[PDB]
Amino acid sequence: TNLCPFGEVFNATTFASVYAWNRKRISNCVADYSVLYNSTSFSTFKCYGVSPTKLNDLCFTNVYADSFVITGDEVRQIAPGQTGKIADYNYKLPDDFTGCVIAWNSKHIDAKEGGNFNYLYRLFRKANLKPFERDISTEIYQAGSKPCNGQTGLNCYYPLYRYGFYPTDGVGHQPYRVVVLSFELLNAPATVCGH
Amino acid sequence: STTEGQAKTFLEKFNHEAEDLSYQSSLASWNYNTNITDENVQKMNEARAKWSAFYEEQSRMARTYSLEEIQNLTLKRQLKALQHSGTSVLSAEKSKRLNTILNKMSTIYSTGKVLDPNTQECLALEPGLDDIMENSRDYNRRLWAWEGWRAEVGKQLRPLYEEYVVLENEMARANNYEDYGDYWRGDYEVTGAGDYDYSRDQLMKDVERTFEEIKPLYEQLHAYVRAKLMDTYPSYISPTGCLPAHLLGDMWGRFWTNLYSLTVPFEHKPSIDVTEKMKNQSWDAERIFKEAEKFFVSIGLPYMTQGFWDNSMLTEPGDGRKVVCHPTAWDLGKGDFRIKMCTKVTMDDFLTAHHEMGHIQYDMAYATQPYLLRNGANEGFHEAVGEIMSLSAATPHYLKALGLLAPDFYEDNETEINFLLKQALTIVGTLPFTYMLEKWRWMVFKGEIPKQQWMEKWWEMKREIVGVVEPLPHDETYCDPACLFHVAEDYSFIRYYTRTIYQFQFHEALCKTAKHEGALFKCDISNSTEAGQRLLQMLRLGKSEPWTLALENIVGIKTMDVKPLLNYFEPLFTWLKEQNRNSFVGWSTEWTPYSD
Ligand SMILES: *[C@@H]1O[C@H](CO)[C@@H](O)[C@H](O)[C@H]1NC(C)=O
């Protein structure tokens, strides 16, 4: 009867780059999701499965809290059946997704004058990601026919790049911290319940 | 695999690098256009150096994908725009020479100073020596300021401008253009789009045809203004001669705005200038731009971003240093929009604010386009969008409903003529000036004007086309073209001509959407979402479509037409026709203020 460590997920000092999105497994604990909803400190809190008001009265065998940072414009891609750079090459939610996408504006932490470049995203990849896939490779993407020999050049570009987060950017280009909560339901008994 | 796919991949890479580099360059330029310190000049130059080198590299990269093997048209357009070296096609020596020439010319312009023979009181174009040209009625002061400017600052620019023409002609010819003027006309070019194409000399022809149609209105405005000014300058103006250049309202005669005081038709009825009422209701620049935002919102357009209000400089730096005041609208990228304008509590800056915020509205509209397609269709589409806002915002009504024109005030025949005469002094007066200046530039670049007649032909063209004569005979030592801002800092000028033509097609089609009744000049598009919806269908395009089309998305046509301009000013046309039924409409190019 211990509490779920959602605090170290949402209140984490640094988040992951979206290409290397960070997963935490949540088990053997009691969660009060209604406090996460009624925090009202979020710009996006969209549940594509259960109603956010209710999950305090539900049990699951496991919860997966994925977290990363993207641009505000890109937050619409953290959803089922979305295309674009984040949903194709970085973080692809499945079509039958049954969790919630939470996201808030992290201007006051993840941006700074001169440029916060800590955060990356994958720009090229030979094919799209499978649901909940995670690719952290830094192999040179070969756009043309000549091999790249592990160095950038003509038709050879390093796959990952950086978000330049400046405090004077537009809201579409401001850093947003994203946490996706996935609720899984196997015949296994439930180690995560509301209340 | 295919070449078009590699082109897509390369363009994506370019987009994501160029966002950051553009924001660096724009932010350094903003910090210098707001702090103006040696340090800021250095940072500005370094950011722009990184930026320009990245472009030379990326243009070399983009030429490696042949346009021949590409079919998706937006990709083709981004690659064509990316495949252009500009000044880079010159040798390193020639490019550095050209950049130093541009720098010296710009600094000569910005720091040029002359001294009142009276005392010394050196006065630079800024405030004084401009204040004179806009406020003085003393013939001698105007003449001294005009001639001293064109002698003390123009004579410095003459050899620099000669070498400038030489080098930049070499640049254009290296880019397979026939001359630098054709290199500028290449903005309106449209290729590979059936029924929508457009050539670089078709602009020549269309501009000259539209100006042929403009000439009668301008001739009668010229006759009437010459009549009023002859009333106020008896011994100085021939009734059949051309207008002396130094008596035109500003340092060049670019706009006849400041002549309203001496030329207003009905001087005993409410003159249209809220300059006082704004002062009496205690308006600041904050209120001015808030009202502009309210205007745009009333039409279906979004509010300004909060970053706009926080980062923009709307007021002369109270205790900061320098700061350039030329009203400019900044699209730094990364959703960051700002406006730099040393706003005064006047009607003039009140209209300029709507103009610049319309620029920003365009920038915000096409911000979803790829970075290479984030621009007004041609060089003019931006300025015409800016000007239709001032057209609407200057209407007696708009000022009435804004609480800046006494609601108890009748839009009678005579106030409408007064408003038309002011609007024509500003808009119509600049058209022959602009066409003539750009024509002179075009001929100098094409090589049709020899150096030893450069100015002789400058003034002939002033007498013939503009109806304006120099008050002092100028030898080729002078360089009066380079005495205007845009000439001395390498800016195309025909964009203001084409702005004025497009802005009345737009403003007609938008006033048809807004269900406006009466003469087109009294139109107000406020409170009409159908008008703004129609305008956004073009704005959001950016240049992802040849301007011909965008233009169809508003006015339905794809041609440059003066007929809307003439419909706007038709009432003042007939009134001027009546107030000249017994005057001499036209001018003789022989009379000068110095031939007796
Ligand atoms: C994070 O900190 C807030 C206090 O600002 C606290 O109310 C909350 O419980 C913490 N954890 C989460 C998951 O929000």
* B6: nearest CB among A143, A172, A173: A143
The phi and psi torsions of A125 (rounded to 5 degrees) equal -170, 145
Strands A100-105 and A44-47: antiparallel
Q: Atom 5 of ligand 1 has which residue's CA nearest to it?
A: A11
E-strand stretches of B383-541 = 468-469
CB of B167 within 8 A of CB of B90?
Answer: yes
Q: How far apart are CA B327 and CA B315, in angstroms?
A: 11
Distances (CA, A) of B26 to A129, B88, B334, B360: 36, 21, 11, 15
**A12 alpha carbon to ligand 1 midpoint, in Å?**
10
Residue whose C-alpha is closest to residue B188's, from B380, B430, B382, B387: B380
Region label for B489, one of left (φ > 0), alpha (ψ between -120 and 50) or beta (otherwise): alpha
Q: Dmax over Cα atoms in chain B, in whole Å?
A: 79
Q: How far apart are CA B160 and CA B172, in angstroms?
A: 18
Provide the shortest C-alpha distance from residue B77 to chain A (in Å). 20
User: Are A124 and B27 within 8 A, CB to CB?
Assistant: no
**A7 alpha carbon to ligand 1 midpoint, in Å?**
6
Residue whose C-alpha is closest to residue A50's, from A187, A181, A179, A178: A181
- CATH code matching the domain that covers A7-193, chosen among 3.30.70.1840, 3.30.565.10, 3.30.413.10, 3.30.499.10: 3.30.70.1840
CB of A173 within 8 A of CB of A73?
Answer: yes
Radius of gyration of chain A (CA): 18
Angle in degrees, 0-180, between the axes of helices B430-446 and B494-513, rounded to the nearest 10: 140
CB of B344 within 8 A of CB of B314?
Answer: no
What residues pair up with A182 in beta bridges, in sequence order? A64
CB of B44 within 8 A of CB of B26?
Answer: no
Which residues of chain A have a CB within 8 Å of the CB of B337? 170
Domain ranges of chain A: 7-193
Identity of residue B269: K
Could you say which DSSP state residue A38 is in? T
CB pairs under 8 A between A and B: 56
Could you say which DSSP state residue B244 is in? E
Burial class (CB in 10 A: 0-12, 13-18, 19+), B31: middle
Residue whose C-alpha is closest to residue B576's, from B428, B407, B446: B428
∠ CA A33-A36-A40, rounded to 5°? 145
B84 is catalytic: no
Residue given tokens 């630079």 in the structure block: B124
DSSP for B125-166, written as a single string: SSSTTTHHHHH---HHHHHHHHHHHHHHTHHHHHHHHHHHHH
Residue of A6, A11, A179 best suited for mutating to test ligand 1, as the one with most atoms within 8 Å of CB: A11
Q: Residue A137's CB: how many other CB atoms inside 10 A? A: 11
CB of B486 within 8 A of CB of B261?
Answer: no
Burial class (CB in 10 A: 0-12, 13-18, 19+), B124: middle
Helix (H, G, I), strand (E, B) or coil at B252: coil
Minimal-distance CA residue of chain B relative to A141: B9
Q: How far apart are CA B173 and CA B584, in angstroms?
A: 46
Burial class (CB in 10 A: 0-12, 13-18, 19+), A62: middle
Residue whose C-alpha is closest to residue B101's, from B181, B167, B174, B170: B167
Which of B2, B9, B19, B29 has the highest number of chain A CBs within 10 A, making it the mutation to test binding with A? B9
Residue whose C-alpha is closest to residue B256's, from B429, B98, B115: B429
CA atoms within 13 A on the CB side of A163: 32
DSSP for B526-548, written as a single string: TT-HHHHHHHHHHHTTTTSS-HH
Q: How far apart are CA B285 and CA B307, in angstroms?
A: 17
Residue whose C-alpha is closest to residue A93's, from A62, A125, A129: A129
Provide the shortest C-alpha distance from residue B13 to chain A (in Å). 8
User: Are A169 and B336 within 8 A, CB to CB?
Assistant: yes
Residue given tokens 């088990």 in the structure block: A27
Burial class (CB in 10 A: 0-12, 13-18, 19+), B570: middle
Q: Residue B317's CB: how many other CB atoms inside 10 A? A: 14
Q: Atom 8 of ligand 1 has which residue's CA nearest to it?
A: A7
Tokens found for residue B135: 């406020």
**B218 alpha carbon to ligand 1 midpoint, in Å?**
71
B356 is catalytic: yes
User: Are A166 and B23 within 8 A, CB to CB?
Assistant: yes
Q: How far apart are CA B130 and CA B404, in angstroms?
A: 28
Q: How far apart are CA A81 and CA A71, in angstroms?
A: 19
Q: How far apart are CA B475 and CA B151, in angstroms?
A: 10
**What method was applied to determine this entry?**
X-ray
Resolution in A: 3.7
Angle in degrees, 0-180, between the axes of helices B381-394 and B285-297, rounded to the nearest 10: 100
